[PDB]
Amino acid sequence: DMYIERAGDITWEKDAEVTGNSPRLDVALDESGDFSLVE
Amino acid sequence: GETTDGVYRVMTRRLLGSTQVGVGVMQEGVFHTMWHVTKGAALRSGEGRLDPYWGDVKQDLVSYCGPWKLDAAWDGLSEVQLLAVPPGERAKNIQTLPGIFKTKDGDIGAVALDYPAGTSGSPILDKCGRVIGLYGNGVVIKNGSYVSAITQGKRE
Ligand SMILES: Cc1nc2cc(Cl)cc(C(=O)Nc3ccc4c(c3)CNC4)c2[nH]1
To answer: Can you tell me which residues form the catalytic site (chain B)?
Structure first.
C-alpha cells in the first residue's frame, strides 16, 4: 500500500541553482509510453 | 486526508523500510503523478484514501480524486525550474533551459537534469509558479545521462 507525504510548496525561487544543457534529440514514443533515441 | 495544494512524496512499505517510488502534485483537490510511479494503484493520505480517476500508459500520467487540472505550458523560450524532490533529500528548485524532443507527432520540451528514479513525478514550473509538466519520463543519451520530457496532460 502506497502513501503520500507533503514535501513543500509549489513556488518559483529567485536565485536558485542554474544548471543543465538544452539538447535537441530525435526521439520515438512507443505504445507502452517509453521513449527511445532515433539516430 | 491531507488535500492541501503542494508537492508530495509517493512512498511504499512493501519493500525494505520506507522506499520513495515517486513524487506528485496536489492542485485543486486532485493528485497528479506519473503512471509508472503508482501503476494506477490506490494511494493513502494518513487515514483518507485516494482512488484513481484518469490514467494513460502512453502519456505516462494519472490523476486521483478528479480529472487532470494542470494545463500550463512551456513557452518554448524561457528558463524553467524543476522542483526536484529526491529520495531522502529535501525539495529543491533547480533552474535550467529546456531542450527539445523532436517526435513524428510534434516537438516537446525536455529537461537535462539527472536524478534518481524515485524523483519521478516532480513538477516543472514557469516564472509564475505554474506547473508546466512532470519530470520522470525520457531517454538515456550517449553520455549515460538522463534527459526527461516535460510531460503535461490535458484539461477538459
Ligand atoms: C536510468 C534512469 N534514470 C531515471 C530517472 C528517472 Cl526520474 C526516471 C527513470 C525511469 O526509469 N522512468 C520511467 C520508468 C518506467 C516507465 C517510464 C519511465 C514510462 N514508461 C514506464 C530513470 N531511468
So the answer is: 36, 60, 120
